[PDB]
């Protein structure tokens, strides 16, 4: 069990498919600080639900996916396998054993891209 | 586009099992040595040619589920274990042990490992 800390940045997703990927935004940064989760995909639940209500809003079948807590297709040709969704990432192995969600660390990257960085 | 090379490791039947594990289970070495020294152009064409090796190879496959075995036929990766899935995250996947690919050039079957997406994660910092 593990909480979330940091500060974020101020379409982002655009970004997504290429570097680190794109920072979490501040206004989510702001949303989830210092909320306790019990598991990873806990924590991703709580982050797209975030990208939903804050009008960074996404074609109606991305918008309906996002309201429910999940991560958005993302386009076709930066899909991977049964990987088709955008993924959170962190840029350093510095979760302190899962009892941290370093909203500063945490990235949010295509899953080709997401292969790529960490090696392909 | 990168060539495999490796060797891989000996494994028995319940080689899955250590998928969500240390590092992964490692490439089984029959595995390897089908592959080694080929071409792929994209990791997926990589990944297709790994789960299509595993559904030709009795020992290997043989501890698969009817669902997993279909999956294998054409390539794709096998469902695992329910409470090793993450999100949309349901099959196996292939890790990099070390960010040693030289830009996508080879495919190092001593290096490359399968895991689950919940043990994956983990492995870089969930
Ligand atoms: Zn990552
Ligand atoms: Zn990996």
């Known amino acids: 069990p593990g909480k979330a800390t940091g500060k974020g940045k101020p379409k982002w997703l ?13 206004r989510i940064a702001d949303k989830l600080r210092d909320k306790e989760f019990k598991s990873f995909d806990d924590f991703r639940k709580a982050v797209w639900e975030e ?5 960074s809003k996404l074609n109606p079948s991305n918008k309906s996916s996002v309201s429910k807590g999940y991560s958005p297709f993302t386009p076709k040709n930066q899909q991977v396998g049964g990987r088709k969704v955008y993924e959170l990432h962190a840029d350093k192995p510095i979760s302190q054993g899962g ?10 990257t295509t899953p080709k891209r997401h292969i790529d960085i960490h090696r392909g």
């Not at 655009?14 to 501040?26: E, H, L, T, V």
Request: charged residues 40%; aromatic residues 4%; negative net charge.
């Open 14 to 26: 655009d970004d997504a498919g290429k570097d680190s990927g794109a920072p979490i935004p501040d």
């Open 51 to 55: 990208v939903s209500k804050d009008p």
């Open 99 to 108: 009892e941290v969600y370093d909203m500063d660390n945490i990235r949010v």
